[PDB]
């Protein structure tokens, strides 16, 4: 099989004795990318002010969040230092080498600055066809308000400011597409219902005003236990993080 084809081997020395993927020297093993994809990373983070929400905030949504195992399309700007120099996390880098998947994701919503209550819904039959989130007053009514019968969780910030949920796989097909394009008209159906786990909506439930500094919502994510990165195609070409901010100014 050509991908691993090694003809006419010329090997001067014997192989190097094993450490069981680090288990001999350190106390743990490192043999599967799936394990690393289960270590949380930043999915999206933003600040929301009263001006971003509807004039009359009738317990409306704060964030409409599309759920992709390969993460969102990052926007590196002066306001987002992480995406600019850290770029994409490990999970989007891992995901890029595989075509398909079939599992769920585990999220962690951290809301700071708000004394009210937060509601979270999962819309598996309504996933976005764009790789960017929708904020506040730009969210359509169909999603801006709590829908019935969807799997949900409602949490008071007074008890805990961190929400922990696991989003399931509810798709009509065999696989979900990894690394999908937002420019897709020839296969809209694939992009619409065979790509994302369904939008996750994060809203507020109370009359408390938002501080002038605003509230900050940080969504971390990771792969669930039933998740699988399925068919290994090539890796795409990469960029180097050390080529964002140069070492010509070692401290900056």
């Amino acid at each position: 099989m050509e991908r691993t084809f090694t003809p006419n081997v010329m090997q001067p020395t014997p192989l190097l004795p094993t450490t069981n993927d680090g288990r001999v020297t350190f106390g743990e093993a490192f043999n599967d990318l799936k394990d690393l994809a289960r270590r949380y990373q930043l999915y999206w983070e933003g600040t929301i002010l009263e001006g971003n929400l509807r004039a009359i905030r009738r317990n409306s949504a704060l964030v409409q969040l599309p759920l992709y195992p390969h993460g969102l399309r990052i926007q590196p700007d002066v306001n987002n230092p992480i995406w600019n120099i850290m770029r994409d996390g490990h999970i989007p880098v891992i995901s890029s080498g595989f075509r398909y998947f079939r599992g769920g994701l585990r999220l962690r919503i951290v809301v700071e600055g708000l004394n009210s209550c937060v509601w979270v819904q999962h819309h598996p039959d309504r996933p976005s066809i764009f790789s960017r989130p929708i904020i506040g007053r730009y969210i359509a009514a169909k999603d801006a308000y709590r829908n019935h019968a969807y799997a949900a969780y409602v949490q008071n910030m007074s008890v805990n400011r961190t929400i922990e949920v696991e989003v399931p796989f509810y798709q009509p097909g065999l696989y979900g597409m990894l690394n999908a394009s937002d420019n897709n008209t020839a296969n809209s159906f694939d992009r619409l219902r065979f790509t994302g786990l369904g939008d996750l909506l994060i809203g507020i439930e109370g009359e408390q005003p938002i501080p002038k500094e605003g509230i900050e919502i940080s969504v971390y994510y990771s792969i669930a236990d039933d998740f699988s990165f399925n068919i290994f195609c090539g890796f795409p070409p990469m960029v180097y993080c050390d080529e964002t901010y140069s070492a010509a100014t070692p401290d900056l």
Binding site: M1, R99, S181
Partner: protein, 260 residues
């Protein structure tokens, strides 16, 4: 050459077609081979199979690559697979038709289809040239956000592929098991959306087949030395199943949208 006949030519037969080869191949398999089980959950209508028609090795394209157009990463072939192959018989207006090729005749009367594929690439160079090809496959590649970036031969080396050494004149076979978002592909342009809905899907686009230049084709500087070489492709189907019987004209075939 040491016999009255040249030497022994290996033979490969399928249905009523016989292919001859003379050298040791380069082979690969796109994904793990398997027997499908969830396709039975998709259609209650009995899935018809036509092995003598579909298991037949069929001849695809010939593509001619010359010394003057052979650069690193030159794409001799970039085709949606198996769409381009099944739809290779077009009319005056470049509209495909499944009605003339016996291998494709089941596609005309069925709405949904599934199979595993195998692709052979034949090059017949003389003893005095040098060059290298890579034939690779990318599952549903055109839908990926970085598809054009994966076109570079450096990226092709990482996806399932086979190599053709023009200096050795070897044949090569690439096995491509069926893998898709659904347990069936569509044969034609059906169930597009309406005023509000947009459910649009390409027929038979399981992925993209590449044939690219790994090492540029080189020749003797002599005048009467062939500066050209034809690359021929053959395709066949392993587990061809068809379901959803319909009239051959209940659904139409559009002029196919090409790749960049």
């Amino acid at each position: 050459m040491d016999r009255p006949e040249g030497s022994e030519e290996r033979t490969v037969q399928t249905s009523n077609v016989v292919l001859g080869e003379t050298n040791i191949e380069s082979q690969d398999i796109a994904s793990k081979e398997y027997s499908p089980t969830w396709d039975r959950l998709a259609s209650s209508e009995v899935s018809d199979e036509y092995p003598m028609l579909t298991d037949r090795w069929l001849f695809w394209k010939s593509v001619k690559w010359e010394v003057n157009d052979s650069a690193f990463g030159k794409m001799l072939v970039q085709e949606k697979f198996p769409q381009s192959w099944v739809q290779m018989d077009v009319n005056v207006n470049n509209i495909p038709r499944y009605t003339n090729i016996p291998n494709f005749i089941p596609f005309n009367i069925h709405q949904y289809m599934r199979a595993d594929f195998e692709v052979k690439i034949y090059v017949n160079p003389n003893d005095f040239v040098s060059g290298w090809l890579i034939m690779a496959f990318l599952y549903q590649g055109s839908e990926m956000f970085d598809y054009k970036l994966r076109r570079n031969p450096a990226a092709l080396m990482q996806m399932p592929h086979v190599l053709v050494n023009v200096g050795a004149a070897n044949e090569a076979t690439l096995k491509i098991p069926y893998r898709y978002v659904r347990p069936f592909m569509r044969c034609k342009d059906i169930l597009r959306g309406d005023n509000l809905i947009t459910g649009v899907t390409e027929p038979l686009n399981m992925g993209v087949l590449f044939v690219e230049v790994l090492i540029p084709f080189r020749t003797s500087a002599a005048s009467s030395a062939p500066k050209s070489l034809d690359v021929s492709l053959f395709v066949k189907m392993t587990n061809a199943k068809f379901t959803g019987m319909v009239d051959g004209s209940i659904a139409l075939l559009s002029k196919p949208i090409a790749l960049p």
